[PDB]
Ligand binder design. Structure first.
Ligand SMILES: [Fe+2]
Length: 634
């Protein structure tokens, strides 16, 4: 005789040993436990191998050999006097003026530059500073998913502050209030637990090895609020920027646009309106933060890693849920390990203006980690289902025929792309989940929900009772891993390579009051940017510029959403679902024929939604299925 072997119980026991949760002492939300976040402490198959290797060896190479070496060289360089290696007679930060920097930038456009825009950045447009091209980023930039209808209380607040400054023209627009949109970063204070008297400051220290020399520099951030009007023709126009929101507008400092329609022209040109150009640069730091922390890192990288852990712990390999979800995980785990190790500490905490210091010792007391922590807690899995997302933020893509969202290619593209995926999920899911009863009698789904709700710390994940709830939930997992991440990741090089367009943080403190702001000149906007060889600003530009170069490297064809729709070949797991005779392989091949046929179709509609934008608007080519990654693999 022997010991009785339970195949499933044995498998899920070995998984709960390999895929353990982190305990939260490292300062991050719940993730895969990896001692010191080292490569060799990962599951054998989830760690990087040489390129061109058998999938068994590993996941190949996540980042560019040479690009990683550079970013590390930079983040390690901790003396304020730039190394001899990096030093050049001509660099993109040297300046000293904006003009000099803009001139260098355009010389560096080719003809690597191996992103989807091929080395072009928003600097190609001579009016990158403009209200049109600023405001458009909230719809077609790197963070197009946060913009929202203003509450009646935020409108009534700006009516009060406008009538206090004595601008009856703006008061009228807001008091009527047709299509008043908001971009609210005021939550940054409550997320870090900073009071309204306190101000965001990252004191960077100069080091010789480990020993600090007493010399420091400072980067500053702001809890900015931006109020827009969306016009009937589809153009988004910014009306007012609050620099740093502190409880009420009375206590904050709020500049209004001198141009109240996008067609307006004033005696002070946009290019020469330094008070407004500054106010825009401040809010471009607030969006940089919300993007790299909330929208990019939390709401895709870390939420998906929780799904990967919970699913590996609860649902056995060869189960249908495992075979539809697992393709969308390739490289994600080893990627996030490198992020917790190198990118968030060395780079994000360094170049952001939350602080309190760089370097740090305890990251638990570091406001960038308090923000990551807060964004993860305040994520809502069901409210970020595209149909729910759009309805909640006040965008009726479905029902509007006025061409008012013509310049919102994200919302147009996703509303379609969501349905295409959900259509593929429904057809495969209903292949075995024939009623609410089969879901309720399922061994793993109730425990899978509970695992993610509790251990994963995503209480907003549904208690799956019905086939509709299961389908939306599997969809949200694939949406998050593939298109939603592709959207917010693959345009980074374009909107960040030209730092002054969207800088990580300010290099000078905010003005004392509105009077001081109103007297701002070019010298004040140039001082606030990482321009010059002084104050270790070389480091701030090089990181701001090379981190996007590192992350924006264009997905190889094999790791595409459309190559999977074609073959259903799971790169991650090195098997194909329709070679598993257990499942209805005739239905799944049909679901994939339709999926692949829907993605070819969708590519033409995405192209058309980009071309349908207001003349001269920047293209939105990011959700092209050929350019959409199967998974969060960079
Ligand atoms: Fe990413």
């Amino acid at each position: 005789g022997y010991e009785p072997i339970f195949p499933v119980k044995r498998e899920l026991d070995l998984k709960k040993r390999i895929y353990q949760w982190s305990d939260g002492t490292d300062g991050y939300p719940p993730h895969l436990k990896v001692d010191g976040n080292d490569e060799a402490n990962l599951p054998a198959d989830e760690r990087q191998s040489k390129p061109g290797s058998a999938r068994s060896e590993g996941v190949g190479q996540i980042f560019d050999m040479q690009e990683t070496a550079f970013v590390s060289k930079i983040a390690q360089a901790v003396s304020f006097i730039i190394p001899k290696d990096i030093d050049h007679e001509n660099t993109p930060y040297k300046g000293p003026t904006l003009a000099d920097v803009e001139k260098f930038n355009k010389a560096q456009f080719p003809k690597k530059a191996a992103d989807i825009m091929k080395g072009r950045n928003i600097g190609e447009y001579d009016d990158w500073y403009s209200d049109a091209r600023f405001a458009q980023q909230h719809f077609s930039g790197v963070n197009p998913s946060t913009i929202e209808t203003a509450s009646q209380d935020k409108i009534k607040e700006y009516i009060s502050e406008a009538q206090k400054q004595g601008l009856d023209k703006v008061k009228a627009i807001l008091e009527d209030g047709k299509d008043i949109l908001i971009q609210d970063y005021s939550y940054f204070r409550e997320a870090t637990g900073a009071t309204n008297e306190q101000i965001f400051q990252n004191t960077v220290y100069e080091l010789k090895g480990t020993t600090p020399t007493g010399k420091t520099t400072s980067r500053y951030a702001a809890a900015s609020v931006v109020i827009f009007q969306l016009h009937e023709d589809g153009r988004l126009h910014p009306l007012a920027i609050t620099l740093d929101y502190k409880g009420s507008l009375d206590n904050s400092i709020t500049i209004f646009n001198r141009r109240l329609s996008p067609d307006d022209t004033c005696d002070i040109a946009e290019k020469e309106d330094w008070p407004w150009r500054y106010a825009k640069t401040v809010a471009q730091t607030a969006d940089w933060a919300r993007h790299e922390v909330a929208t990019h890192l939390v709401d895709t990288h870390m939420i998906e890693e929780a799904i990967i852990v919970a699913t590996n712990r609860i649902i056995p390999e060869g189960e249908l849920l495992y075979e539809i979800l697992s393709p969308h995980w390739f490289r994600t785990l080893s990627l996030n390990a490198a992020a917790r190790k190198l990118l968030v500490p060395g780079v994000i905490a360094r170049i952001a203006g939350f602080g309190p210091t760089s370097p740090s010792l305890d990251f638990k007391g570091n406001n960038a980690f308090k923000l990551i922590d807060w964004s993860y807690k305040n994520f809502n899995f069901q409210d970020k289902y595209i149909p729910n997302d759009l309805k909640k933020r006040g965008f009726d893509i479905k029902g509007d025929k006025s061409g008012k969202y013509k310049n919102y290619p994200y919302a147009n593209d996703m509303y379609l792309l969501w349905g295409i995926i959900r259509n593929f999920v429904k057809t495969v899911i209903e292949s075995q989940y024939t009623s609410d009863h089969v879901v309720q009698k399922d061994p793993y789904i109730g425990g899978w929900c509970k695992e993610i709700q509790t251990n994963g710390q995503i209480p907003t994940f549904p208690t799956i009772t019905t086939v509709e709830q299961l389908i939306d939930a599997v969809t949200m997992c694939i949406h998050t891993a593939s298109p939603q991440h592709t959207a917010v990741n693959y345009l980074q090089d374009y909107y960040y390579s030209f730092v002054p367009a969207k800088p990580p943080a300010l290099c000078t403190p905010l003005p004392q009051d509105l009077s001081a702001l109103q007297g701002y000149t070019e010298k004040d906007l140039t001082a606030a940017l990482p321009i010059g060889t002084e104050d270790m600003k070389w480091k701030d530009w090089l990181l701001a510029a090379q981190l996007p170069e590192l992350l924006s490297y264009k997905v190889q064809q094999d790791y595409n959403l459309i190559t999977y729709a074609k073959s259903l070949y799971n790169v991650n797991k090195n098997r194909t679902i329709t070679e598993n005779t257990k499942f209805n392989c005739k239905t799944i091949k049909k679901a994939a024929a339709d999926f692949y046929s829907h993605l070819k179709s969708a590519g033409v509609e995405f192209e058309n939604y980009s071309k349908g934008q207001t003349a001269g608007t920047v293209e939105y080519p990011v959700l092209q299925p050929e350019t959409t990654a199967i998974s969060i693999l960079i």
